Amino acid sequence: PLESQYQVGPLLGSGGFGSVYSGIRVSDNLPVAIKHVEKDRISDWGELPNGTRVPMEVVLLKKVSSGFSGVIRLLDWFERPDSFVLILERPEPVQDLFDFITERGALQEELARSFFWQVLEAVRHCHNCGVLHRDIKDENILIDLNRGELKLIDFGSGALLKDTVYTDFDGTRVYSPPEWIRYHRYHGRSAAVWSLGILLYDMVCGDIPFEHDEEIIGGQVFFRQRVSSECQHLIRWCLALRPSDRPTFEEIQNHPWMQDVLLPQETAEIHLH
């Protein structure tokens, strides 16, 4: 039974991702987030090894939710007559990276490096697990402000990872690559790398570089804040117009700008506490 197991709290937010509430699990008072998604809005369905037919989001979360990682984990889920309910982890205290950058402005490079590194590790983990998120953006990253750990959320636009072309997309357009804009075609890793370039620019400049389709396909990166030459280089590499000119995850993590990353705990002590 869903309603006797969780105590429901205030609405945290709602939108394309459903309605998400704060909650506490009654059995041990563990903090949780409770996401409701209406069946009529689930366009993408999977199946569990169960054989149970579930929203794709549940399949993806289960594939990435084993062990520890930088992904907010699915603790449980339930089906209702017109909806699915997902019980997700809830770090406390938390702020999403969109609000963090709004409030703090452009991030010092040491902070952006630590954050960006953790996002890279999380995305690697998803890919190791056969999962493509397809909506990497500041809004979909939560910062645990005490542990200095970043956590990916909202896999509702994601897919199983494959090596062949994707011709569908439900993520955020201003983080989508130019081959999607021009051709409605992209490959998973290369499109992920582009969204990571958008994210890194967002971190060191205080907002994303592009709003309009013509800017996305122009691939001219104007720097609106002082950014080091090494960081500009990495961003511009991630934002290569030709997908095959973008770095691999390995190349991003071996980039000189990425060396000497702070530990999560040092990050919290220096930058968040």
């Binding site: 939108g15 394309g16 991702f17 439900d170 955020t172 907002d207």
Partner: peptide, 9 residues
């Protein structure tokens, strides 16, 4: 200059 969220889903 205006910073805003951008919906998906």
């Amino acid at each position: 200059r205006k910073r805003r969220r951008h919906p998906s889903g």
